Design a protein around this ligand. Structure first.
Ligand SMILES: Nc1ncnc2c1ncn2[C@@H]1O[C@H](COP(=O)(O)OP(=O)(O)O)[C@@H](O)[C@H]1O
Lengths: 383, 92
């Protein structure tokens, strides 16, 4: 029956379905409504999502992630070459096309970036099928607004490899605006700002809406700013603490630092609705239990410059859109980091107390909108 | 406007009759459209023929291909009326 919406995200992916009058954002078998865009290969299994993410410390070189950054690209792309340094997995050259080389079941294997993204997509496809009790084929998949044709065609190709028929490739900030029904309003054209802060990237797009038609007037942001960086500012806080308490540097230690990063991401989320979080790691480094505390005030202090600095791309987007901030009619909160109370305040203050569209889990908003659009592009939504 | 009135008159007279809509869709298409040959009733008798031509119609007017185009608003309108026509045809 139904067509689904899939947010194919740099760090997390999310699938939703328009069904029986509502959009349901669908939890995976672990209970999670977003799913890491991670593929891990071991001696015995190909792991996707959480199981892949949870083992990245014991198996760093064979846990692929960040394929969205390789998709639609040539190997000799500046961006590919820059980013490669940061990854623990190997990226090889297959006639001007990036591949990822891994060890899977004793053998060396390489995969194209759309093949990795196809694995994530297959995983999301199964999540929807488990919920719906039938097979899913038709889907709308989303991409960043700045994506070119080659990147859009590669994302569509990823769907086909996942056994999906892709009804459309649509832009992320547009989906989020569809989630809010911003196009179902009589009157003069509306300027909409999409403030989107995920796990790896920061996107600000301004959009005009009149008669249900969308155009992108401007975009800005930082392809290397997201919740991961706030996690980093936390890791090093605790690397330093650990050292003072124990006279040991866990910094040489790749698995110790990875294990602390997970602890840290977990506490950061707790800090979005509570004012302190506990860190609790058994045998972090050479047999030492690491238990500690962090407050929201402190978390915010360690990130004060990156939080505040998300306002530059906003200003920049407005001046490219040739708009003063008071000419923005709707502001939309997207990406799981927009849950961080301080981020909320700083954007609102900037817009002089104007109320922010956030009633929909910001990390689910893109998938929400893709679900709406998938129903429409089928005929599951009339009148 | 003249382009929207056209399609809204087209929908009205044809009474959600898929064959009637298909055999006259060429009269409401945007000037510029070349991918569509006018189809007579001769090619709309059997449900095979309706289906085959319907699946050819929705490709022309798909809202995804039409995104950004000056005619986008009209592609949407025709798409939606055809989807409803076809679902009425399936239910028969
Ligand atoms: N409650 C929370 N508080 C702070 N950050 C969160 C919370 N929930 C999710 N995040 C962050 O959102 C990021 C992922 O956002 P999301 O929009 O899902 O990803 P993507 O950017 O991959 O589309 C991660 O950094 C995650 O830590």
């Amino acid at each position: 029956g139904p067509a689904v919406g899939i947010d194919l995200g740099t760090t997390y992916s999310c699938v939703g379905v328009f069904q029986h009058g509502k959009v349901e954002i669908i939890a995976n078998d672990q209970g999670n409504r977003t799913t890491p865009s991670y593929v891990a290969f071991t001696d015995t299994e190909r792991l996707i999502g959480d199981a892949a993410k949870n083992q990245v410390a014991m198996n760093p070189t064979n846990t692929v992630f960040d394929a969205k950054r390789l998709i639609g690209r040539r190997f000799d792309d500046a961006v590919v070459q820059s980013d490669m340094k940061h990854w623990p997995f190997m990226v090889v050259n297959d006639a001007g096309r990036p591949k990822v080389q891994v060890e899977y079941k004793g053998e060396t294997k390489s995969f194209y970036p759309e093949e990795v993204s196809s694995m994530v997509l297959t995983k999301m496809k199964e999540i929807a099928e488990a919920y719906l009790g039938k097979t899913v084929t038709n889907a709308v998949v989303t991409v960043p607004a700045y994506f070119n044709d080659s990147q859009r065609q590669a994302t569509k190709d990823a769907g086909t490899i996942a056994g999906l028929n892709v009804l459309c490739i649509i832009n992320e900030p547009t989906a989020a605006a569809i989630a809010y029904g911003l196009d179902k309003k009589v009157g003069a054209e509306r300027n909409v700002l999409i403030f989107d802060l995920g796990g790896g990237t920061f996107d600000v797009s301004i959009l005009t809406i009149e008669d249900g038609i969308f155009e992108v007037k401007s975009t800005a942001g930082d392809t290397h700013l997201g919740g991961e960086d706030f996690d980093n500012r936390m890791v090093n806080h605790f690397i330093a603490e650990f050292k003072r308490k124990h006279k040991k540097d866990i910094s040489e230690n790749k698995r110790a630092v990875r294990r602390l990063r997970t602890a840290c991401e977990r506490a950061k989320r707790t800090l979005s609705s509570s004012t302190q979080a506990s860190i609790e790691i058994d045998s972090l480094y050479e047999g030492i239990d690491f238990y500690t505390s962090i407050t929201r005030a402190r978390f915010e202090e360690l990130n004060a410059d990156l939080f505040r600095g998300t306002l530059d791309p906003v200003e920049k987007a407005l001046r490219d859109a040739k708009l003063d901030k008071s000419q923005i009619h709707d502001i939309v909160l997207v990406g799981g980091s927009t849950r961080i109370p301080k981020i909320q305040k700083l954007l609102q203050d900037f817009f002089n107390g104007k109320e922010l569209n956030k009633s929909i889990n910001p990390d689910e908003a893109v998938a929400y909108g893709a679900a709406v659009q998938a129903a429409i592009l089928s005929g599951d939504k009339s009148e | 406007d003249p382009e929207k009135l056209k399609i809204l008159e087209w929908i009205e007279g044809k009474e959600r009759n898929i064959r009637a809509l298909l055999s006259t869709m060429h009269t409401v298409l945007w000037a510029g459209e070349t991918k569509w040959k006018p189809v007579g009733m001769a090619d709309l008798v059997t449900p095979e023929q309706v289906k085959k031509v319907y699946r050819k119609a929705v490709l022309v007017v798909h809202p995804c291909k039409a995104t950004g185009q000056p005619y986008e608003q009209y592609a949407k309108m025709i798409f939606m009326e055809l989807n409803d026509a076809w679902s009425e045809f399936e239910n028969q």
